[PDB]
Amino acid sequence: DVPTPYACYFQDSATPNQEGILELHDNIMFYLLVILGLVSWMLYTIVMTYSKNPIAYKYIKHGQTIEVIWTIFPAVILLIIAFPSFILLYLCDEVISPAMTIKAIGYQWYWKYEYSDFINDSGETVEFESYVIPDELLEEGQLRLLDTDTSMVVPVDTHIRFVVTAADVIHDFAIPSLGIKVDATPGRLNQVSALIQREGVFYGACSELCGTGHANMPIKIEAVSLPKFLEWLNEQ
Amino acid sequence: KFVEGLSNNKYKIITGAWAASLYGSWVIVNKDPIMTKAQKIVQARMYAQFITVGLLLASVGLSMYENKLHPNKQKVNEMRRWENALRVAEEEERLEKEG
Amino acid sequence: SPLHTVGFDARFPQQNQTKHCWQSYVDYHKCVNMKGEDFAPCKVFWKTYNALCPLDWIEKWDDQREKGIFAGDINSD
Amino acid sequence: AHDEETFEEFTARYEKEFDEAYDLFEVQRVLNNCFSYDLVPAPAVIEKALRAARRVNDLPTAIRVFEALKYKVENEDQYKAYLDELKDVRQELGVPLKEELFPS
Amino acid sequence: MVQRWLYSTNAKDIAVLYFMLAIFSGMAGTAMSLIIRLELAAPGSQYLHGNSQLFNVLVVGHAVLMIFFLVMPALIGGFGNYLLPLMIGATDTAFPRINNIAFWVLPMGLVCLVTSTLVESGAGTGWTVYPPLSSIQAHSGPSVDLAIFALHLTSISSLLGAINFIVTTLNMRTNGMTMHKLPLFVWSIFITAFLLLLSLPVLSAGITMLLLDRNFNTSFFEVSGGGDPILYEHLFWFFGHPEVYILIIPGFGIISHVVSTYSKKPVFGEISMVYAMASIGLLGFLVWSHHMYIVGLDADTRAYFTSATMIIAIPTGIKIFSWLATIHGGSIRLATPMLYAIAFLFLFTMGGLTGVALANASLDVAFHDTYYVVGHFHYVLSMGAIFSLFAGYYYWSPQILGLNYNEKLAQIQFWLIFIGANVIFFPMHFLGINGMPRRIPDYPDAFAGWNYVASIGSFIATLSLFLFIYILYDQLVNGLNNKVNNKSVIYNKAPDFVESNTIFNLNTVKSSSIEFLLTSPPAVHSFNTPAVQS
Amino acid sequence: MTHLERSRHQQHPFHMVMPSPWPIVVSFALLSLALSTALTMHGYIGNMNMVYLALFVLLTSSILWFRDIVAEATYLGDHTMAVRKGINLGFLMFVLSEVLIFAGLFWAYFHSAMSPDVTLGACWPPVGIEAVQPTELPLLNTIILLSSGATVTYSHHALIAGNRNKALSGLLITFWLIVIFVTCQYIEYTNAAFTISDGVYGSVFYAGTGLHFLHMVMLAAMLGVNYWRMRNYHLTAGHHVGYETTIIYTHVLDVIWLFLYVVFYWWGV
Amino acid sequence: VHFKDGVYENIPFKVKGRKTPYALSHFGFFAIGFAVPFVACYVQLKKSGAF
Amino acid sequence: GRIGESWVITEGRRLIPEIFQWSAVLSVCLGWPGAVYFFSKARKA
Amino acid sequence: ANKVIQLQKIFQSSTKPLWWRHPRSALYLYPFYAIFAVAVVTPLLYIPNAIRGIKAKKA
Ligand code: HEA
Ligand code: HEA
């Protein structure tokens, strides 16, 4: 969810998409570390046993057997690597039957979230601009530069598909915990799906250049249970 | 009655005929074994573009040969799409009410 | 309990949805200008554009419709 | 010829290439081209190399044959069972080895 | 002397000037890298107080200056201009005034790029200068216009050098060079000069479309008005991937030559290696949108591009396997360009493996505009092209300059840049997979350790370049004394085992290309007569 | 012949160019042009007088460079057959680079045309913009290029043959033919319903046709230079590489005009 | 005219016969090269804030 | 080979001491982030 | 007007450089040197006026 000092792994799982991305990255790294180990072992063995070699086998310049095996081995490993990424790419675009929708339109150096599925029985759509808390009005426990005074809040255990766009410079809606990253270009709406499997906060940042206020542009998504979300949406 | 399907693809037939025209002009002109490669290429290109822009007006005559058979297009295909867009709304909300 | 929305349209399954909002908006203004001036099950289109595309786009297109400089004209007489 | 060379064609080709050399550059050149192949040559090659180094009348290339061979072989049992096969040529030609010449 | 350095249509005295602007601009770009990584060392507003626009200006200056004014000159311009006529036996290149105007329109691109960072605070977009971030509404001023006029001038320089190289190795070869007998660096400069004139026209068209919708009121990417900014991403990255393949292919040529000559062995299957390099060249156009997996392409075209970037990945693999095969079984003489050649293999295999981790269009949604990407390209660009650049200089400059360097200082320079650059870009992977975005002035203070470790490394990587500057000085004022007084290495190819010293002094240089047979600093008319070959 | 009067020559066919001061001057002028047109686009200098003189000094330095190359090619006499094949292949690769700029412009047209945005009315051409019909003036200035190609190819094949009165007549009438093309193209520009700012359609349309417009006015300057040095007896019967260069250029300009014309005037309306 | 060749007639620097030491020119070249981004930072830090 | 110490033993003797130093140089060419994390205050130092 | 061999006999037989070897080449290069020096030194006095930010006096 949130980053940790001196960490060397992913911000952990919330969505089936992020679980699939974590499993796929570990499978790809498991297939890559064999190649890295044998490349480093070949380099070490060669440069520490042929440096103290006084003659050079200069009459070895081609061999077809070992040439075609080292050109057919990376094709095999790359087919095995590309075999599950097709499954993830073709399932992470499957947005059949979501529950509710969000718009996450990003202006210059803030976001503006809006819900308009009409169960708020005041009648209207609900919007809020979601400015960063400036870093002198922090009050004794608040995470620096990625906190927000007005969070987005989503429910648990419903598929939510949110579209995203801008009104200016190309932004990016990017949370690494939910595995969601999509460029908010000002011309088109871009939709991505989510199924958040546990309550709690999730932090993210803008991951496209916006100009001066690129760092002062965070995303804070609290995921609460469905009755508390219904109460919040009716009250707000 | 074939004008519908092979006049929907005008600018595929024109481009394929241009490529085949340059090929069938080049294989004719290169059989003369006296000239430079460049003169053969530019003569083949000239013959090809002449027959291609000559066919571009034949397709205009064919285009109004299609236009009498289908009057005032681009605007009544839009309303066929609109009828298929209204049926998909009524079929859906009637089962939303009784489902 | 309920949280229903537009579901999944078969015409626009891609990642972009700008044509989906623009077509739903122009077809709302094509239903309620043509068959009957307001009484319908073409509130589906209203639900769809008001769910999908943002308020600045809706305000810009409605002021363009008022001034008459709308892009895809809505069969108005 | 990029087709492979069998051992008999190897030793016949190189014996007829050690017989023809006349200068010192030629003997050291064909000795380097014989040793920088993959196999170690049979002593039918190397006693002819010793004779071809005797024909040019210089000593240390009739010693570096033996040290290059000690670098060539896989252990020292092969080296000892090799060196007792070139005993009398080393005797009547009078060349030394390295380990007895430079004791260290 | 004015007609020998200002008019100077001779391809030997243009390459020295190329190298002088290369070392000047590389010093400026690494000053910018030092300032960036010095400001990012700790959370909270460091040395430049506030002022994120200045940091954006500094990072676009570092990126575009060190790409288009150090690596592309000191690999294409300098090394091709000095060596491509000197390996195929041309007396010097065809169209000589064309590669004089290429050099002389480089530093005016440099001076307009320098004065672009002073007027109206400045162009900050990053080197991939995007709309509507750079259109006149969100970025006003004459700054980014001068910043892309620099790209127009550098684009013109590299294309003129490309046409020059292509014709001068398609016609003026020597007597016996057939269509496949050239040394592999000639083939690298060949294929790179093809990719230049097949790629950068699209770049210059896209960025002049950016200029005339900035100032001439057109609407190519101004979206309220018809256009779309996705068309710039297409039109830019159609050059943007062939640009780095252009920057890395002469690196492959240099590394092939130095591992061929420092292991006393020919390269394992030179014909298959040049087929792999040429297929990498003709295949590097078909994968241009692996930098655009996020913007909203379909899953079908994303599936195509994540299929095709792995077939991009395979011939680089067979090239690295042939490099391991040609250093296997050798007689490896560990001098200072051979050390850089050995380090390049490991430090580029590492970046290529994390590159194919990036190449999955599935996996790019967790890694885009994130310091994992910086860890990948600051491996395969930095360590790749510049370890090949150092293995070009430390291997060729005793022949070109005619002054032998110091050897122990060269080895402490190699180990200092190796350690002090491996400590920078390795924590960038942990910063990436923990969630740090790119181009931030600084960050939420969770990941406060790896930035400090990278900043304590960048000072080592700068001190090694200061020692490289002292290596240049010690080579320039103590060349003959390093020839005589036993501080250097003199013979790069050692005598073989059974060869005497009196026999090594007959055949001193056992080369396979022409360049190590010309005398130190070579004559201005080297090939009076052609250089025959069978 | 004698060795003594064989070693008094070049010993290889390739060109050895004396040090000439026209990379440095035209590079100076290119820098001044770039900075002055980056400086006057924002109102820092008052008028366009300085970008005018910068463009003029670039033009006159490059025409002095071409003066130096025609003097070296036909007076000092170094362009032998190896150097001739070299400069021929160099011009072929330069024009292969120009057609890729044209391909980038066609990529822009196709990408914004076959997927039209929702602010254009979702139809190509957009709403309200009266598109140019392809059959009135486009038909004249697409048949005039074919007639220009036919007369420049018979002027070429009369130059190889030996007659002067035919090989000069073809060059004169192809010069006046394509300048009649350029003038009626300007006539087409000065009464058209959309400008370069009116939407994306006018933008990419005027970008493509204006780049072809500037390319053929540069071709007309090239052909005027070639007619001058054909009248002044520079062009021979077997050493006309600077004329084969421009006929290759005008034939590829004709075919890229027909591509531009078809997909800019028939499919795009 | 073929320009005459030597060990120090291939570079624009004159090294052996001078009046000033070579270290002055050789380190001032990279001094101005290393100090052009510092003067860019100074002219950008006096235009907006302080310094 | 045929006569001598066997090739399995005479190449195991050459390569088995090489595996441990390869593991050392790889564990200190990729494992120094562990050594810099070990002394910092995040490990309650 | 068939004046190519006289120009060749002049151009081969001189010591002056190529861009100064013609008879009428004094009228082509002195005004060029003047206008080129003016046209390239003139934006380098307008660049500090742009660095200071002071625009023109137009309208
Ligand atoms: C040429 C490519 C290149 C190289 C070598 C480098 C090397 C360095 N770079 Fe980077 N960098 C980029 C190109 C490069 N960079 C690009 C394209 C971006 C993206 C910008 C964006 O997207 O916004 C970027 C971004 C970038 C970031 C990420 C910032 C961010 O976007 O958030 C950082 C942070 O550390 C950085 C700093 C450094 C430092 C300290 C080095 C150090 O390694 C520098 C030390 C290097 C040397 C010491 C090399 C030797 C120098 C010589 C001059 C040798 C001379 C020899 C010869 C001429 C033969 N640059
Ligand atoms: C020098 C130019 C250069 C080179 C050569 C590469 C090499 C590669 N790169 Fe990289 N890359 C960049 C320049 C380059 N890159 C730049 C400039 C960016 C940042 C752009 C920005 O600003 O956004 C970037 C970032 C980047 C992205 C964009 C991600 C993003 O921004 O969202 C991608 C996407 O696919 C990528 C992938 C690859 C791959 C697969 C290779 C391959 O070519 C690597 C090939 C090497 C190997 C594969 C290893 C050796 C092979 C073996 C050991 C055999 C076994 C291997 C296998 C079986 C796989 N890198």
Ligand code: CUA
């Ligand atoms: Cu919004 Cu960065």
Ligand SMILES: [Cu+2]
């Ligand atoms: Cu790429």
Ligand SMILES: [Mg+2]
């Ligand atoms: Mg991006």
